[PDB]
Symmetry: C2
Subunit: 293 residues, 2 copies
Amino acid sequence: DHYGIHEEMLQDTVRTLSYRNAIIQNKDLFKDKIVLDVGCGTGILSMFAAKHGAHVIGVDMSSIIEMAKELVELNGFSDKITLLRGLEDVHLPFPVDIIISEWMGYFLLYESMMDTVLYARDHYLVGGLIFPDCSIHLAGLEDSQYKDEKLNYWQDVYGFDYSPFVPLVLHEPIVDTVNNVNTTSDKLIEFDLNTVISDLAFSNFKLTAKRDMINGIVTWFDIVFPAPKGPVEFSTGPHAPYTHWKQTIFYFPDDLDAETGDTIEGELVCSPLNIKISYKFESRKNEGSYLMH
Amino acid sequence: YGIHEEMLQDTVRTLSYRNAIIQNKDLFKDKIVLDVGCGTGILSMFAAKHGAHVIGVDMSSIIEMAKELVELNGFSDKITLLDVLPFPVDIIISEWMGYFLLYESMMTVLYARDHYLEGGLIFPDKCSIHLAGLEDSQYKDEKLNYWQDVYGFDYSPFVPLVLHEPIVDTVERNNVNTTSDLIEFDLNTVISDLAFSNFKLTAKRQDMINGIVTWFDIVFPAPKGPVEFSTGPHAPYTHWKQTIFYFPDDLDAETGDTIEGELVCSPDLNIISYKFESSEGSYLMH
């Protein structure tokens, strides 16, 4: 029952309207069907499905289910929505056609519930649909003025040398909203939720300077929804409208004074999130270790 | 790393601990100090630098950097970092205060006092919780109106969730429109006392009163004949800010009007019955 987290998401109009417009686009396929809402939160996605032709089962392990039952009751969906607190533990009233789920995290796979979505697909899904059914992208960034201040602070802390703290600052990823992207973007990996857990621990990339100082990489993820034959999508990149996911910044140990045409080539390893990235800067070689805790 | 940077950049707090150690530098000489929740160990280094052996105890993986910093700053011979003591202590320094003073507080300090500390000193050794009233009619009205219509759906039942949640934020000084009045704590004599008050507030002008802003004051021990700091909206910024509790109704108050109340605090933190003469609120911190 932390209301800020539910507010943040509902106030993310890009996120919420994407799920709504995807349900409406496929409302013919929602008609007279059984929907499972993984991580229903307040139940907004469940109410969307039920009003547009769907029974919907919402499963969230938070105490917010008590509020969801009250909201579902107040808007006249009590006969079409059954909410259960607790997915590997709950017992569905039905042995499902459509899976709607809001599962994405900051780095897509940081605090994501995709493991639960794959579980729902493998155990409850009939050709069934999966809203949404995603890719991670990255590019170079200029953050020299902000980064230098954060690092300079530790040279003198009330007289004491706090220099060994600097490696901590370089290792922590930064979730923030990034004009300052000065390289081309590359695609790290694709995920098809219909066929993809072992695939999550996983890529090479190549970036070329478009003009600047390069101090790190900004990363985001794209989302695509299923659509009938002949799709609703949205991005969380610095070139797209704001989302509550923002972007994830990884700093370099060294600051590259690059000119146009220079290249940053690398290999990113992601494993349970431990992120090790080896770089090559051609105009040389460096690495970066980051931990999401 | 976020928290530790936030601690050190709170200059009001850190310099308060420093200046308190410096004021009592005569009593720190050649003595043993216990740093409860040493974090990065800056308070341990302060005691050691100004005449103290200091033992820092933190259950976080930070004790490792503390070591590296202590090693780098020449205190390896005076500071030992980290159920756990090399000594069977004269002074307890501790940074233990939380939001509302008690929420997630480390007031472990009483355990160190009762088990490891007679006539020893405790930095700081005195606390107080205060409160007054404020006008946040414009921001509060925004939050609660959002739920009347959420993508067509009636989200009315949610508002109480928003009116019950405490808000940790910095209140501007000009928005306090009543007088200030909750409890004292003496770290030398005070766990059962934490579950605990009556208060009375008078409107200092004609304005809207939408809730109470609460803060806490801190006092350090001093020799005969003390360093202190406040976290109120009238004092310089601290990383604690203030804690706001909303009223269900907004009082359109005139000068001289009174708000009498009783606040009950009991353990997570359950938190107030009001009377507004011109003649309730429950909060949970989780």
